[PDB]
Scaffold this active site. Structure first.
Site, PDB file in Angstrom:
ATOM      1  N   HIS A   1       0.850  -1.175   0.000  1.00 53.25           N
ATOM      2  CA  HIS A   1       0.000   0.000   0.000  1.00 53.25           C
ATOM      3  C   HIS A   1       0.890   1.229   0.000  1.00 53.25           C
ATOM      4  CE1 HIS A   1       0.691  -0.415   4.362  1.00 53.25           C
ATOM      5  NE2 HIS A   1       0.535   0.898   4.387  1.00 53.25           N
TER       6      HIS A   1
ATOM      7  N   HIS B   1       1.635   4.070   1.627  1.00 57.92           N
ATOM      8  CA  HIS B   1       2.007   4.932   2.739  1.00 57.92           C
ATOM      9  C   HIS B   1       3.514   5.156   2.739  1.00 57.92           C
ATOM     10  CE1 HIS B   1      -1.728   4.326   5.558  1.00 57.92           C
ATOM     11  NE2 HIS B   1      -1.878   5.322   4.704  1.00 57.92           N
TER      12      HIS B   1
ATOM     13  N   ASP C   1       5.900   4.738   4.835  1.00 63.93           N
ATOM     14  CA  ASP C   1       6.815   3.739   5.365  1.00 63.93           C
ATOM     15  C   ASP C   1       6.925   2.491   4.499  1.00 63.93           C
ATOM     16  OD1 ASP C   1       4.103   3.472   6.382  1.00 63.93           O
ATOM     17  OD2 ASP C   1       4.821   2.150   7.999  1.00 63.93           O
ATOM     18  N   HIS C   2       6.228   2.439   3.358  1.00 67.20           N
ATOM     19  CA  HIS C   2       6.312   1.288   2.472  1.00 67.20           C
ATOM     20  C   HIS C   2       6.572   1.635   1.016  1.00 67.20           C
ATOM     21  CE1 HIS C   2       5.048  -0.879   5.959  1.00 67.20           C
ATOM     22  NE2 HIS C   2       3.980  -0.104   6.056  1.00 67.20           N
TER      23      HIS C   2
ATOM     24  N   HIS D   1      -6.667  -1.097   5.556  1.00 68.75           N
ATOM     25  CA  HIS D   1      -5.594  -0.247   6.041  1.00 68.75           C
ATOM     26  C   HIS D   1      -5.434   0.979   5.130  1.00 68.75           C
ATOM     27  CE1 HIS D   1      -1.934   0.745   8.210  1.00 68.75           C
ATOM     28  NE2 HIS D   1      -1.420   1.035   7.037  1.00 68.75           N
TER      29      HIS D   1
ATOM     30  N   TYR E   1      -7.479   4.821  13.648  1.00 72.00           N
ATOM     31  CA  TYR E   1      -8.542   5.102  12.711  1.00 72.00           C
ATOM     32  C   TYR E   1      -9.872   5.196  13.450  1.00 72.00           C
ATOM     33  CZ  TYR E   1      -5.527   3.445   8.793  1.00 72.00           C
ATOM     34  OH  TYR E   1      -4.549   3.266   7.841  1.00 72.00           O
TER      35      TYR E   1
ATOM     36  N   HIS F   1       5.337  -4.894   7.720  1.00 67.78           N
ATOM     37  CA  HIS F   1       6.057  -4.887   8.986  1.00 67.78           C
ATOM     38  C   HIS F   1       6.297  -6.338   9.379  1.00 67.78           C
ATOM     39  CE1 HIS F   1       5.557  -0.566   9.702  1.00 67.78           C
ATOM     40  NE2 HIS F   1       4.401  -0.730   9.087  1.00 67.78           N
TER      41      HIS F   1
END
Ligand code: JOI
Ligand code: JOI
Ligand code: JOI
Ligand code: JOI
Ligand code: NA
Ligand code: NA
Ligand code: NA
Ligand code: NA
Ligand code: ZN
Ligand code: ZN
Ligand code: ZN
Ligand code: ZN
Ligand code: ZN
Ligand code: ZN
Ligand code: ZN
Ligand code: ZN
Lengths: 266, 266, 266, 266
Positions: D83, D85, D87-88, D159, D190, D224
């Protein structure tokens, strides 16, 4: 009673759509488009470069000619453009989907390419094509190097804001050949004076004539070969009558001056 | 053993983030940003125009000041930009989501805005902000008219490729005031000579000094007020010490010449 | 010997291009398109909403009908779409340039709109139009509120991945009217089974039939009026024969089942 | 008196930024990211695929590890994402500029990637990164084939709207290994119930738990690693404790149910 008009397709002379076999320009440079539209393949030990693709319907033909030259889709690394009109950048989107190629262009050309040639300063929505995104934005005079061939961008705004000449040095018969792929300098149907969408149009064309005249230019090629007196169907004499960049620029300026005078009278 | 560095936020002097109340420049023009970043509101009978928004975190403050001036979110029709760096175009994306505003910019500024200031020619990814799309692409010298106020774009490339001066005529004490919102002419940390990402940088700055010197310019304003000797906190004397466009251009050129000499020595 | 084919324009039945005067659906909802393509204007005290625009060449006609209804270009605030094909989203780009309108759409529709309908899952590049950008991305079930009218998005993927039904409640003769603008449920020439570009096509259509059947639906309208048995030229009886959403969904499912059987046999 | 806050950088635990050497997962699949962020390299005879890149500052490290594996920048053909975001997908834009890689993603992920993670449904502008464009849009269940390795997309929205599991079959000790790279199933901070920006959030998460439970899944990996009980620093036992996809899905659903109950109480 009366419906709105049907959409009208962008139709062109048959010769612009007539496939031809690859025609060698220099040791690593080939014309791989149609009889009357330029699409240049430059083959390096580190992949191939395409400068222009012609009309939207030429994508498969171009890939055929690449295959004939030993260039698979993975090997096409870079597409460069003279300018982002349908008859020169037409198949770029499809080429990107079908090959490894990434597009480098100036900001003006990138913006027009991304809207598929719609909202053209002069043509409106009459001459559109599939939109494509640029992967790299280039500045005036910036170089791009592929497999040791150095391509230099020379902005020459006028025909479109983003019009660009691309230059590189190939070899032939052992000697260097400075190739100049100069963009179009025509203004087909354009309002030249006092154009609200292009206020400095005339100044830009004049600077562009001077840019073209001074290019490193052992061999000139142009998006429409006839503009530089190439005859792609003439075989071993295809380039015999080609203009110098100086003559191309002068002829374009004389035509432009005539168009200005006629616009003032019209 | 050693992790990669944390991302570093773009932090600025507190005065650049210090909210101020609207400060009137002319009958319809107001500074509505912070003490040390310009954001100009021009109010017309047919909606409002915003020139720059400052830093990304200024969006709500700007909307507060618009409300104080009688401008609701629906009434903001147009955002114009000096250039598309984080400290001047920062809140544009959020402003578009929260108001009726559409963005007009040149192709260079539109391309940089659409990548949120990433891949900057000089700053890399160190100074980014939320990306936004332009709704209209403007050419050099093009006019945009809102509620009878005519804004003219004057390209002045250098600080960014797309740097623009915006000019318009307001009134004050019954008389016309030709306002020039001239962009930055600094080159902070830039490699000026032989920059591969900007080969004609020096030529562009020199032409831009000349463009700025010749602008219609009863009143000069700049994205950083200190560049034009404004003091937004000085109240009734905020603009008393402002430079002419001629003096602004000359000072920027002298600084640039010094930077060139220091770069040659460094 | 044989040139490549000319580009072929997307041509349609004349009735799809036949202008009509605004036809009132409810107190604030009007059909303002052509005889055979829906374009809905919803007028609120806080601006107007347009749902679809039909073909690319309809933009000026739509603006004429808006003017007739008292809606100036500044007053058009929002464009919503059933789906982003040329015969329904055709004039969106031009509408955005000529009005205050911003586009809200789901991610699928936004992606297709931004490529002008090129690289269509089923049509390739045969049915393209000027690309446009969405200003707001909507999620399934999200509401958008204009001047007190609440529009709810109901995703109904199939005809395109981003196909959407839009619902809102108007009034008529003092009473509430729940209007359902349900998207197309056709699959014209589509490969339904084992389509590599759309592996879950069948499942999506089946879920969409069920979504349509359950919509709040005092009055159904569809992008092609004939799909819901509207006759825009029939005046006071234009909507007399309209299907319920239940009947529309059932008829579309029976047609789809027949197409599946024929595809298995073909 | 009080300036607006400085922008706050997206900072993470050091282990998420701790470089590691390539760790072999199967014959052609390697973890090449950091200790606590997954970035998977799949090497084929026809170029390499990268699934995720971690944080924005990881680009050079990733290229180092590719070089260590025999993958030059030209050889990286494709980037896939769990996805979009920070951090990815953080370094995707820079990876595209520095390699031959093209990005394939679903429409939701493409839209978020193109805005650099700004205007996030839950995080706003707090977690942004350089925007990137997708080269190919993929549909649910669509396959992409590189050098004979077949990657299948399984949408698992929640997510993010565009969250995707990617599956492929590698080999190890002579036998097939069905690898499932399942996306995150967390909902950090969320609002789950009645979220106006995501009305069907709960339904989507529930369907996604079921999708994950049924994936072909000899080996599960997650963005993660701790979510699937991997310990990338544990060497030959890095994957010994890994969860099955069934256990991962069940644990995520139990956590989600707890978060729902706490939200109802909070
Ligand atoms: C005699 C000769 N060598 N000619 C005459 C036509 C073109 S000149 C111009 C017009 C053409 C295009 C069109 O008319 O279809 C429009 C869309 O630009 N391309 C143009 C260009 O200079 O690139 C080359
Ligand atoms: C004394 C005075 N009046 N000054 C000094 C700093 C700025 S000068 C330059 C540097 C600044 C920005 C930054 O350093 O954060 C970078 C990203 O451009 N903006 C710049 C601009 O000229 O627009 C104005
Ligand atoms: C009998 C009736 N009510 N009909 C028959 C044609 C359309 S059905 C379908 C085909 C049409 C479009 C085209 O053929 O030009 C393609 C591009 O989609 N639009 C479509 C849609 O359902 O939206 C409505
Ligand atoms: C114990 C364990 N294995 N954990 C705990 C933190 C992440 S869980 C979640 C939060 C994180 C990210 C952040 O907090 O910086 C936001 C922006 O999403 N990534 C997330 C994801 O599931 O992808 C993995
Ligand atoms: Na670039
Ligand atoms: Na424009
Ligand atoms: Na949005
Ligand atoms: Na695609
Ligand atoms: Zn042209
Ligand atoms: Zn041409
Ligand atoms: Zn700046
Ligand atoms: Zn600045
Ligand atoms: Zn359709
Ligand atoms: Zn249709
Ligand atoms: Zn995440
Ligand atoms: Zn995460």
């Amino acid at each position: 009673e009366v419906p709105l008009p049907q959409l009208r397709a962008y139709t062109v002379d048959a010769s612009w759509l007539q496939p031809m076999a690859p025609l060698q320009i220099a040791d690593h440079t080939w014309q791989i488009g149609t009889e009357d539209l330029t699409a240049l393949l430059v083959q390096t030990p580190d992949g191939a470069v395409l400068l222009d693709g012609g009309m939207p319907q030429m994508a498969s033909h171009l890939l055929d000619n690449m295959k004939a030259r030993g260039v698979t889709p993975r090997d096409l690394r870079l597409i460069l453009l003279s300018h982002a009109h349908a008859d020169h950048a037409g198949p770029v989107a499809e080429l990107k989907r079908r090959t490894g190629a990434k597009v480098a262009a100036n900001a003006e050309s990138a913006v027009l390419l991304a809207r598929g040639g719609s909202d053209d300063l002069h043509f409106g929505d009459g001459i559109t094509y599939p939109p494509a995104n640029a992967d790299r934005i280039v500045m005036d005079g910036e170089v791009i190097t592929v497999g040791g061939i150095v391509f230099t961008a020379h902005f020459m705004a006028g025909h479109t804001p983003g019009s660009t000449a691309w230059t590189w040095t190939d070899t032939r018969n052992g000697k260097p050949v400075r190739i100049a792929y100069a963009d179009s300098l025509s203004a087909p149907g354009y309002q030249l004076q006092g154009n609200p969408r292009y206020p400095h149009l005339i100044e830009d064309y004049r600077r562009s004539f001077a840019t073209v005249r001074a290019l490193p230019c052992d061999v000139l090629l142009t998006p429409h070969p006839g503009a530089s007196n190439w005859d792609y169907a003439a075989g071993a004499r295809a380039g015999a009558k080609a203009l110098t960049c100086k003559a191309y620029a002068d002829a374009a300026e004389q035509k432009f001056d005539g168009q200005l005078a006629k616009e003032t009278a019209g």
